[PDB]
Protein backbone atom coordinates (compact mmCIF):
# COMPACT_ATOMS: atom_id res chain seq x y z
CA UNK A 1 0.00 0.00 0.00
CA UNK A 2 1.05 3.61 -0.60
CA UNK A 3 -1.37 4.89 2.05
CA UNK A 4 0.64 6.69 4.71
CA UNK A 5 0.45 8.64 7.95
CA UNK A 6 2.70 11.65 8.46
CA UNK A 7 4.01 13.15 11.68
CA UNK A 8 4.82 16.48 10.07
CA UNK A 9 7.08 17.92 12.73
CA UNK A 10 8.72 21.28 13.32
CA UNK A 11 12.04 19.47 13.77
CA UNK A 12 11.53 15.96 12.44
CA UNK A 13 9.12 14.31 10.03
CA UNK A 14 8.13 10.64 10.32
CA UNK A 15 6.15 8.53 7.89
CA UNK A 16 4.23 5.39 8.76
CA UNK A 17 3.32 3.23 5.77
CA UNK A 18 0.13 1.18 5.84
CA UNK A 19 1.13 -2.45 6.30
CA UNK A 20 4.81 -1.71 7.00
CA UNK A 21 5.14 0.61 9.99
CA UNK A 22 7.56 3.50 10.34
CA UNK A 23 9.55 3.78 7.11
CA UNK A 24 11.05 7.26 7.35
CA UNK A 25 12.29 9.58 10.08
CA UNK A 26 14.19 12.65 8.85
CA UNK A 27 14.85 16.24 9.94
CA UNK A 28 12.32 18.70 8.56
CA UNK A 29 14.96 20.73 6.71
CA UNK A 30 15.33 21.80 3.09
CA UNK A 31 18.49 23.18 1.43
CA UNK A 32 17.95 25.51 -1.49
CA UNK A 33 20.79 26.44 -3.85
CA UNK A 34 20.41 29.78 -5.62
CA UNK A 35 21.51 29.27 -9.21
CA UNK A 36 20.50 31.83 -11.83
CA UNK A 37 18.50 33.95 -9.41
CA UNK A 38 16.08 31.03 -9.14
CA UNK A 39 16.18 28.54 -6.27
CA UNK A 40 16.57 24.80 -6.69
CA UNK A 41 16.02 22.20 -3.95
CA UNK A 42 19.53 20.99 -3.19
CA UNK A 43 18.88 18.51 -0.39
CA UNK A 44 16.15 17.45 2.04
CA UNK A 45 16.49 15.75 5.43
CA UNK A 46 19.65 14.85 7.31
CA UNK A 47 21.97 16.25 4.62
CA UNK A 48 20.24 19.64 4.83
CA UNK A 49 20.23 19.66 8.64
CA UNK A 50 24.01 19.22 8.60
CA UNK A 51 24.25 22.56 6.72
CA UNK A 52 22.61 24.75 9.38
CA UNK A 53 24.85 27.68 10.28
CA UNK A 54 27.46 26.45 7.79
CA UNK A 55 26.17 27.52 4.34
CA UNK A 56 28.24 29.46 1.77
CA UNK A 57 26.82 32.44 -0.14
CA UNK A 58 24.52 30.78 -2.65
CA UNK A 59 22.96 28.26 -0.30
CA UNK A 60 20.43 28.32 2.51
CA UNK A 61 19.09 25.65 4.84
CA UNK A 62 15.43 26.31 5.63
CA UNK A 63 12.99 24.88 8.18
CA UNK A 64 9.58 25.40 6.57
CA UNK A 65 7.68 24.43 9.77
CA UNK A 66 7.47 26.72 12.80
CA UNK A 67 5.65 26.39 16.15
CA UNK A 68 4.12 23.09 15.02
CA UNK A 69 2.62 24.31 11.73
CA UNK A 70 3.54 25.13 8.12
CA UNK A 71 5.18 28.53 7.79
CA UNK A 72 6.68 28.41 4.26
CA UNK A 73 4.11 26.47 2.25
CA UNK A 74 6.20 26.30 -0.95
CA UNK A 75 9.22 24.76 0.77
CA UNK A 76 7.11 22.48 3.03
CA UNK A 77 5.42 21.11 -0.11
CA UNK A 78 8.81 20.36 -1.70
CA UNK A 79 9.80 18.68 1.57
CA UNK A 80 6.63 16.59 1.76
CA UNK A 81 6.86 15.66 -1.93
CA UNK A 82 10.44 14.52 -1.41
CA UNK A 83 9.66 12.35 1.63
CA UNK A 84 6.62 10.79 -0.06
CA UNK A 85 8.55 9.96 -3.23
CA UNK A 86 11.24 8.40 -1.04
CA UNK A 87 8.91 5.87 0.61
CA UNK A 88 6.67 5.40 -2.45
CA UNK A 89 6.14 1.86 -3.79
CA UNK A 90 6.78 2.10 -7.57
CA UNK A 91 4.32 -0.74 -8.23
CA UNK A 92 1.47 1.45 -6.95
CA UNK A 93 -0.19 3.81 -9.44
CA UNK A 94 -2.81 5.35 -7.18
CA UNK A 95 -2.38 8.56 -5.17
CA UNK A 96 -2.14 7.77 -1.44
CA UNK A 97 -4.64 8.46 1.31
CA UNK A 98 -2.79 10.50 3.92
CA UNK A 99 -3.34 10.95 7.63
CA UNK A 100 -1.39 13.88 9.10
CA UNK A 101 -1.12 15.09 12.69
CA UNK A 102 -1.89 18.70 13.62
CA UNK A 103 -1.38 20.63 16.89
CA UNK A 104 -4.62 20.83 18.86
CA UNK A 105 -4.30 24.63 19.02
CA UNK A 106 -3.70 25.01 15.26
CA UNK A 107 -5.87 27.78 13.74
CA UNK A 108 -8.38 27.21 10.94
CA UNK A 109 -5.81 28.85 8.63
CA UNK A 110 -2.99 26.53 9.75
CA UNK A 111 -5.11 23.38 9.37
CA UNK A 112 -6.21 24.36 5.91
CA UNK A 113 -2.54 24.80 5.00
CA UNK A 114 -1.57 21.27 6.03
CA UNK A 115 -4.51 19.90 4.04
CA UNK A 116 -3.77 21.96 0.91
CA UNK A 117 -0.07 21.16 1.18
CA UNK A 118 -0.56 17.39 1.39
CA UNK A 119 -3.01 17.53 -1.53
CA UNK A 120 -0.49 19.55 -3.54
CA UNK A 121 2.15 16.96 -2.71
CA UNK A 122 0.12 14.14 -4.27
CA UNK A 123 -2.35 12.94 -1.63
CA UNK A 124 -5.70 11.86 -3.04
CA UNK A 125 -7.34 12.39 0.34
CA UNK A 126 -6.10 13.98 3.58
CA UNK A 127 -7.36 13.32 7.10
CA UNK A 128 -6.20 15.34 10.11
CA UNK A 129 -5.72 13.86 13.57
CA UNK A 130 -5.00 15.88 16.73
CA UNK A 131 -1.36 15.41 17.80
CA UNK A 132 -2.03 14.56 21.44
CA UNK A 133 -4.60 11.94 20.42
CA UNK A 134 -2.04 10.39 18.05
CA UNK A 135 0.63 10.55 20.74
CA UNK A 136 -1.56 8.89 23.35
CA UNK A 137 -2.54 6.10 20.94
CA UNK A 138 1.10 5.61 19.98
CA UNK A 139 2.15 5.50 23.65
CA UNK A 140 -0.39 2.76 24.29
CA UNK A 141 -2.74 4.67 26.60
CA UNK A 142 -6.28 3.21 26.95
CA UNK A 143 -7.90 6.11 25.08
CA UNK A 144 -11.06 4.14 24.22
CA UNK A 145 -11.88 3.29 27.83
CA UNK A 146 -14.06 5.23 30.29
CA UNK A 147 -10.99 6.41 32.18
CA UNK A 148 -8.93 9.59 32.21
CA UNK A 149 -5.54 9.45 30.49
CA UNK A 150 -3.21 12.45 30.36
CA UNK A 151 -0.55 12.81 27.69
CA UNK A 152 2.09 15.51 27.27
CA UNK A 153 3.77 15.52 23.86
CA UNK A 154 6.84 17.75 23.81
CA UNK A 155 7.64 18.34 20.14
CA UNK A 156 10.00 20.62 18.26
CA UNK A 157 7.48 23.43 17.91
CA UNK A 158 4.74 22.81 20.48
CA UNK A 159 3.97 20.99 23.67
CA UNK A 160 0.58 19.28 23.49
CA UNK A 161 -1.20 18.56 26.78
CA UNK A 162 -4.42 16.55 26.64
CA UNK A 163 -6.79 14.47 28.71
CA UNK A 164 -8.43 11.68 26.73
CA UNK A 165 -11.41 9.43 27.49
CA UNK A 166 -13.75 7.23 25.47
CA UNK A 167 -11.93 7.86 22.15
CA UNK A 168 -12.22 11.63 22.55
CA UNK A 169 -10.61 14.76 23.96
CA UNK A 170 -11.69 15.91 27.40
CA UNK A 171 -9.18 18.76 27.40
CA UNK A 172 -6.35 19.77 25.12
CA UNK A 173 -3.90 22.64 24.76
CA UNK A 174 -0.99 23.48 22.48
CA UNK A 175 1.78 25.45 24.22
CA UNK A 176 4.47 27.18 22.10
CA UNK A 177 7.40 25.52 23.83
CA UNK A 178 9.41 22.56 22.67
CA UNK A 179 12.82 21.57 21.35
CA UNK A 180 13.34 24.74 19.31
CA UNK A 181 12.57 27.07 22.25
CA UNK A 182 14.93 25.06 24.42
CA UNK A 183 17.69 25.44 21.82
CA UNK A 184 16.94 29.18 21.71
CA UNK A 185 17.08 29.28 25.52
CA UNK A 186 20.54 27.65 25.43
CA UNK A 187 21.77 30.15 22.80
CA UNK A 188 20.53 33.01 24.98
CA UNK A 189 22.10 31.58 28.14
CA UNK A 190 25.49 31.26 26.42
CA UNK A 191 25.33 34.85 25.21
CA UNK A 192 24.11 36.37 28.51
CA UNK A 193 26.11 34.35 31.04
CA UNK A 194 29.22 33.48 29.03
CA UNK A 195 29.58 36.26 26.44
CA UNK A 196 29.61 33.56 23.78
CA UNK A 197 27.68 33.32 20.53
CA UNK A 198 26.88 29.76 19.49
CA UNK A 199 24.91 28.36 16.58
CA UNK A 200 21.96 25.97 16.55
CA UNK A 201 24.01 22.80 15.99
CA UNK A 202 26.03 23.51 19.12
CA UNK A 203 22.92 24.35 21.14
CA UNK A 204 21.41 21.04 20.01
CA UNK A 205 24.56 19.24 21.19
CA UNK A 206 24.41 20.94 24.60
CA UNK A 207 20.72 20.03 24.96
CA UNK A 208 21.35 16.41 24.01
CA UNK A 209 24.56 15.77 25.94
CA UNK A 210 24.03 17.66 29.22
CA UNK A 211 20.51 19.09 28.97
CA UNK A 212 18.40 18.56 32.08
CA UNK A 213 15.14 19.80 33.60
CA UNK A 214 16.76 20.11 37.04
CA UNK A 215 20.21 20.57 38.60
CA UNK A 216 22.03 17.27 39.24
CA UNK A 217 27.28 20.09 39.07
CA UNK A 218 27.04 16.84 37.07
CA UNK A 219 28.91 16.18 33.82
CA UNK A 220 30.36 18.92 31.61
CA UNK A 221 31.26 19.36 27.97
CA UNK A 222 33.45 21.83 26.09
CA UNK A 223 31.75 23.94 23.48
CA UNK A 224 33.13 26.42 20.98
CA UNK A 225 31.63 29.69 19.86
CA UNK A 226 32.41 33.32 19.15
CA UNK A 227 33.69 35.48 22.00
CA UNK A 228 31.26 38.38 21.72
CA UNK A 229 33.63 41.09 22.94
CA UNK A 230 36.67 40.10 20.82
CA UNK A 231 34.96 38.38 17.89
CA UNK A 232 37.35 35.41 17.97
CA UNK A 233 36.76 31.68 18.56
CA UNK A 234 36.56 30.76 22.24
CA UNK A 235 35.94 27.54 24.13
CA UNK A 236 33.82 27.23 27.29
CA UNK A 237 33.17 24.27 29.59
CA UNK A 238 29.47 23.95 30.48
CA UNK A 239 27.97 21.66 33.15
CA UNK A 240 24.61 19.91 33.54
CA UNK A 241 24.03 22.38 36.34
CA UNK A 242 24.45 25.29 33.95
CA UNK A 243 22.33 23.59 31.29
CA UNK A 244 19.55 23.34 33.88
CA UNK A 245 19.84 27.11 34.53
CA UNK A 246 19.53 27.73 30.78
CA UNK A 247 16.50 25.45 30.36
CA UNK A 248 14.66 26.66 33.48
CA UNK A 249 12.26 28.94 31.61
CA UNK A 250 10.90 26.57 28.95
CA UNK A 251 10.81 23.67 31.42
CA UNK A 252 8.71 25.85 33.74
CA UNK A 253 6.25 26.63 30.96
CA UNK A 254 5.71 22.90 30.37
CA UNK A 255 5.19 22.21 34.09
CA UNK A 256 2.76 25.11 34.32
CA UNK A 257 0.80 23.84 31.31
CA UNK A 258 0.41 20.45 33.00
CA UNK A 259 -0.92 22.07 36.19
CA UNK A 260 -3.33 24.21 34.19
CA UNK A 261 -4.60 21.07 32.46
CA UNK A 262 -5.10 19.21 35.76
CA UNK A 263 -7.05 22.17 37.19
CA UNK A 264 -9.36 22.06 34.17
CA UNK A 265 -10.06 18.33 34.49
CA UNK A 266 -13.33 16.94 35.99
CA UNK A 267 -12.89 15.23 39.38
CA UNK A 268 -13.42 11.60 38.34
CA UNK A 269 -11.00 11.90 35.42
CA UNK A 270 -8.50 13.87 37.48
CA UNK A 271 -8.57 11.02 40.01
CA UNK A 272 -7.91 8.46 37.25
CA UNK A 273 -4.85 10.53 36.32
CA UNK A 274 -3.72 10.71 39.96
CA UNK A 275 -3.80 6.91 39.98
CA UNK A 276 -2.02 6.06 36.74
CA UNK A 277 0.03 9.20 36.20
CA UNK A 278 0.97 11.38 33.25
CA UNK A 279 2.53 10.02 30.05
CA UNK A 280 5.36 11.96 28.29
CA UNK A 281 5.99 11.62 24.56
CA UNK A 282 7.98 13.45 21.89
CA UNK A 283 11.63 14.44 21.59
CA UNK A 284 11.28 16.66 24.64
CA UNK A 285 10.31 13.68 26.79
CA UNK A 286 13.95 12.57 26.55
CA UNK A 287 15.08 15.66 28.44
CA UNK A 288 16.81 14.24 31.51
CA UNK A 289 14.84 14.87 34.68
CA UNK A 290 11.77 16.31 32.92
CA UNK A 291 9.57 13.46 34.16
CA UNK A 292 10.85 14.05 37.72
CA UNK A 293 10.43 17.82 37.49
CA UNK A 294 6.81 17.36 36.44
CA UNK A 295 6.30 14.69 39.13
CA UNK A 296 7.66 16.90 41.92
CA UNK A 297 5.56 19.93 40.93
CA UNK A 298 2.29 18.05 40.42
CA UNK A 299 2.64 15.25 42.98
CA UNK A 300 1.56 12.79 40.29
CA UNK A 301 3.41 9.86 38.79
CA UNK A 302 5.04 10.59 35.45
CA UNK A 303 6.09 8.02 32.86
CA UNK A 304 8.14 8.41 29.66
CA UNK A 305 6.54 6.49 26.79
CA UNK A 306 8.38 3.72 24.98
CA UNK A 307 9.86 5.15 21.77
CA UNK A 308 8.76 8.72 22.57
CA UNK A 309 10.04 10.17 19.25
CA UNK A 310 7.82 7.72 17.40
CA UNK A 311 4.58 7.86 19.42
CA UNK A 312 2.72 10.37 17.25
CA UNK A 313 3.61 8.47 14.07
CA UNK A 314 2.65 5.11 15.60
CA UNK A 315 -0.68 6.55 16.71
CA UNK A 316 -1.37 8.06 13.29
CA UNK A 317 -0.42 4.69 11.79
CA UNK A 318 -2.84 2.89 14.11
CA UNK A 319 -5.69 5.12 12.89
CA UNK A 320 -4.58 4.56 9.29
CA UNK A 321 -4.74 0.82 9.97
Numbering used by the authors: 10 to 225, 229 to 333
From the reporting publication:
In non-spherical bacteria, the actin homologue MreB is essential for shape maintenance as depletion of MreB through genetic knockouts or MreB-targeted drug treatment results in misshapen cells that eventually lyse. The MreB fibres are attached to the cell membrane via a hydrophobic loop in Thermotoga maritima as well as Gram+ bacteria and via an additional N-terminal amphipathic helix in Gram− bacteria.
In contrast, the crystals of Caulobacter MreB contain doublets that, remarkably, crystallised in an antiparallel arrangement. (C) Scaled double protofilament from the ΔCcMreBh crystal structure (d_e) was positioned into the EM density obtained from the 2D averaging. Once MreB is in the polymeric state, the presence or absence of nucleotide has very little effect on the overall structure, which is presumably stabilised by inter- and intra-protofilament contacts. The antiparallel arrangement of protofilaments of C. crescentus MreB as revealed by the crystal structure and by EM is unprecedented within the actin family of proteins.
